[PDB]
Amino acid sequence: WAESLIGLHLGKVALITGGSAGIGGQIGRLLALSGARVMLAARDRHKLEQMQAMIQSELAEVGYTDVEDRVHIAPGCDVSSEAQLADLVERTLSAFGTVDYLINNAGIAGVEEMVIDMPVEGWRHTLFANLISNYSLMRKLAPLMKKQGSGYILNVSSYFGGEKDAAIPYPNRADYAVSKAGQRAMAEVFARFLGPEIQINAIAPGPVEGDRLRGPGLFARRARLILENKRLNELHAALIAAARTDERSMHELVELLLPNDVAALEQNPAAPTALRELARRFRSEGDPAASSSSALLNRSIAAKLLARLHNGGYVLPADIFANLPNPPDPFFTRAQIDREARKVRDGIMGMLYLQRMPTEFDVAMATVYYLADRVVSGETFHPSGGLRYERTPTGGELFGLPSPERLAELVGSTVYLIGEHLTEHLNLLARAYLERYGARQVVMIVETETGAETMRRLLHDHVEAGRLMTIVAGDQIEAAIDQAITRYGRPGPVVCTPFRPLPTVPLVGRKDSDWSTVLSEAEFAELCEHQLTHHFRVARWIALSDGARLALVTPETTATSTTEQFALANFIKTTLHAFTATIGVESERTAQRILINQVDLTRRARAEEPRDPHERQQELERFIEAVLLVTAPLPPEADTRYAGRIHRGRAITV
Amino acid sequence: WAESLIGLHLGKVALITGGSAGIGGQIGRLLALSGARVMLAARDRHKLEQMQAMIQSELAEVGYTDVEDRVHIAPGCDVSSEAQLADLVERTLSAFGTVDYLINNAGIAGVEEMVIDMPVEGWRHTLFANLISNYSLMRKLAPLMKKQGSGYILNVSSYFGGEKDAAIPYPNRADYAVSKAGQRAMAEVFARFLGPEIQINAIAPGPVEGDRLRGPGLFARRARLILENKRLNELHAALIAAARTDERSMHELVELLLPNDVAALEQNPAAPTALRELARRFRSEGDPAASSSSALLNRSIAAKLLARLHNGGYVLPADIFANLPNPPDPFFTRAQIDREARKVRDGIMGMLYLQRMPTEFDVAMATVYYLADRVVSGETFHPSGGLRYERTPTGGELFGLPSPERLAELVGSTVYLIGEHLTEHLNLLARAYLERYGARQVVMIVETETGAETMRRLLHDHVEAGRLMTIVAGDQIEAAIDQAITRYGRPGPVVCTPFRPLPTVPLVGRKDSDWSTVLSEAEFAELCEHQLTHHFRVARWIALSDGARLALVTPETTATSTTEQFALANFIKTTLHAFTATIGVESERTAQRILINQVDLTRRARAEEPRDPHERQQELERFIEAVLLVTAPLPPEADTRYAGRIHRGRAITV
């Protein structure tokens, strides 16, 4: 079977991250059988040595000599650490010289939580390990590839990273979905800069049979979260619903859960109907051996609940769940978790056209044959069948304005605008809301005092009339939104624009250059912070603000933007669609059920941009219409199952 | 080099259409070296024998025995002929038994004209050869594949067939682009039915170095058309412009071109400014050795011009260009055609990220490795780099209503509605136009008298008031539009809905069945006639009707549509986007510059469909808004280069 591999990749040096197990282990193994010298990078030393030994043995059986020189290892390499990536490259270069193939395979599962329960640092950690690491390794190895006249960058993405012009929601996995989408987008936008010497593609496999999924594996962990998230979401919504029709504070309502007894809560006449009906449901649909049928929650679900309530603005002591009786193990039975795990597996098998999952060997084989193709760049290869998940087309240009009825509902509204560098857009938008649609007030949340002064001057008349308020956020956007809430009231429309413009630096260096001016690894992390994390932070906080309609706005491209700006802006556009689409679906699972959509100021081609002042004014009017379409209120009566998903997770191009 | 191929496809029977040359010749050759028994199908016998001999010789050099049994030929096989496809299968089955791989490689260039100059039969011929032939061959070979428990259908599509959720315009190649898009869509929708036994994918190569493109090849033919279409479009527009400001009939204006002398026309004081400025330009920008600088046209361009004028409704004798002096050869010089051909080549090389074209061997190699992958279905593999052409995202759901100003311009308008089976949609739309937007009249163009009576009854009040007229088109839609023009005046909005519903037959048969109830090869041709050719015919005619705004409406899917209806409707949706996007770009090249866009009543998932009467009414209101958005007039002042392309070739999902 290995005879088709002999000489396929002979004379090539390949670097494989996550090379000690899974798909990466198989890629490294098959590249070695193909004639390549491979460097396998991962954290655990033993796992790497075991894999190195297995490959070296196979290579000897096949007929290779000096097998120790063909398979090297780089232990203690966590891809989320920049210093560890710099050490990887130095170790690889000293061992084999110039790297031909950079296989960006490592990809952590991530936080595995809904955005509202996702810590910001946990989201940053996923981006560092799965996305930023890919640029960092390319930045270090592409100068040597360009100098020798050839190279290959392969990013191992996923079916759940979506596609060109379509986003795929991945509920509970937004950080992961964004990182996968960014790996594909990197191949798409850097292709033109890296060519003709370097090829850059992505692989997007569908679900793969192996340790990651089988194990507690991804399926078993997803099963436990389904049951944990079900208990959390049901408690959260019922407490929010009770708060609307009850005189007691959230503190007093949460106190009713302290005996942590499902039966006692159901039988409590002093408890609101919403909480009593909830207790009825827990005992009625639960496993009697599971303590989750007799107890409302454990300290872990209690901590997730408290954090949601605190983020939502409810005043509760941090020690409210300190004396909470801990339920005896198991909270969820083996029977419950296994039933849920098999339902996850069956659902995936039913979606696959071939009704079978590939093995890691199957994916790696297809990838290794694909790597021999020298005439393709900027593409996403699908080595295995994808699912039947919802695809959200991104980039619709033909749209109108919402109905006059929806527009009339903006009269007396509270509008929040977030931004700084887009001064024209912010001034035009605040004026349309106050002058055309009779909004009561606009709260202009800027980054700096210089930004606050620029806006107060541009909007002087509305400032003096008390119609426009300014807040300086700095790097504390959540606390600034909390200041906006206490001081001016909860918002209706929320327009989130980036505080920073895109950088204007080269994306590749000249063949004989040191690449010293090229976008650094730190600058790429900064692009992600300002153009991705910025919106994630706002969306995470605004998702618990009842009645909000959030518009996530991407950077602006013009007829005079540099080619590098076009690349980075299109990289952002695509990566953010994954986030917008995922949180769009997650919103339906919460009691607030806010609207979240994306308005794109970025286009693919320079030719499509306005060229004269009339065309510029048309573009600026389209921006107002696009923002109004996603921020006008969708009446409760109209928010049906059908119309609800139409008004969430969409992206429109100005 | 062939050692990596040994045993890769051993024990497989492959059928390759267009197997005597190009990419197909290389696929057959490489499949044979891989261990497969190959049947090569094409028209010319000599070309097939030459290829068969070359492969058999290589096979012997590599070490194979009984080489004559491994490579067979099927001459006189034109894929556009159904009878010839039935003979192909019988010949292949008798030679090697069950076919494992059906390689649908044959793909004719097509008509190579703008839609307005594209004969309807020429468009049908491309669909028969490039698309219908693919279903026909699958219909004959898939029962044997399913019975043996394995099979593979590979459709050779193109980069110019677009992608999932994105259309790519291919000006002058609409028939070809549609056929390519349909080959990809076939893989996408049949995957779930054909699995788990049969795999179905498409390959979408970008431009390929070879005889097709080099030759007179595709580049040289495209160069000659650029110069021919330039002379035709410039003459056509100038004659249309002159007709607006001149007292003379089109007949009398065309008479000024009869001396066929560029100099005499420029120097003619009796000729309108538009024609005199045009003559100035021909002499000024022309090659002096080319008779196109001294003569206005030849009989070929004169025939294309006359046909446009006749289709546009101008009264001219068929013999107007009978006595036209024929210009001496060359009409366009070698220097002119070569300059244009190299500009086509340079433009393609500049768009390719790798700045190089693959060879036929490169594409075929990548394809043959791809064919070994057993764990992927419903995908489009890109074996070579694509261009940087405009991508039109298709399926935007978030849209509003046009401005009240644009809406107010519908007062007193002439509306044409084309349809029959969508009775609810036609009645609702005609009522909105007449009752809500004060349109003067609606002309309801149906297929049959039974359809006319159904509509006259549903719209009885508007019929009696003289506000709703009915026309019975039959299979003569162009003549019916001409009857509408003479009798009721030229239209503003034109809503083109299919006359026929989608069939409700199985798409695959049971493993042990005869497949006798499965959608036949004739029924698939009929689907294409009613759901693709129907809109093409209307769009081809309406493109010359000044002031028209055309909406192409796809079939309807509901929460109760069969799974087969969902597949065929999604097949249509995607295939039509290619047409809409192409004609969208072509419209800018004409003097009429009408709007053409697509409104989709088809969705990908059943779950997205309305489930109750309230959700159904919301869906029906969205249909009205979507149609209004594409049929409200775009004022001349607003039709800028920027805003013009935004309002053409788009597709929105209801």
Ligand SMILES: NC(=O)c1ccc[n+]([C@@H]2O[C@H](COP(=O)([O-])OP(=O)(O)OC[C@H]3O[C@@H](n4cnc5c(N)ncnc54)[C@H](OP(=O)(O)O)[C@@H]3O)[C@@H](O)[C@H]2O)c1
């Ligand atoms: N499995 C699927 O169904 C599937 C489908 C589509 C896409 N993918 C993608 O395919 C890639 C590989 O997936 P897989 O299934 O092979 O995953 P896996 O089994 O989890 O991969 C584990 C490998 O990655 C290493 N690794 C884990 N965390 C690391 C870190 N922080 N830094 C460096 N190495 C690390 C592991 O060793 P250490 O723990 O010692 O570091 C081991 O070598 C990922 O990019 C994933 O997103 C997977």
Ligand SMILES: NC(=O)c1ccc[n+]([C@@H]2O[C@H](COP(=O)([O-])OP(=O)(O)OC[C@H]3O[C@@H](n4cnc5c(N)ncnc54)[C@H](OP(=O)(O)O)[C@@H]3O)[C@@H](O)[C@H]2O)c1
């Ligand atoms: N070339 C490119 O740049 C490119 C790029 C993307 C996609 N494609 C696609 O790739 C496929 C093959 O293209 P190619 O470049 O190899 O084309 P090609 O050189 O024109 O292919 C010619 C081959 O097809 C046969 N053929 C032509 N018309 C036929 C008909 N009516 N019935 C049966 N066989 C017929 C020819 O033999 P006879 O004349 O004897 O019949 C010969 O075997 C097509 O589907 C094309 O759309 C090509």
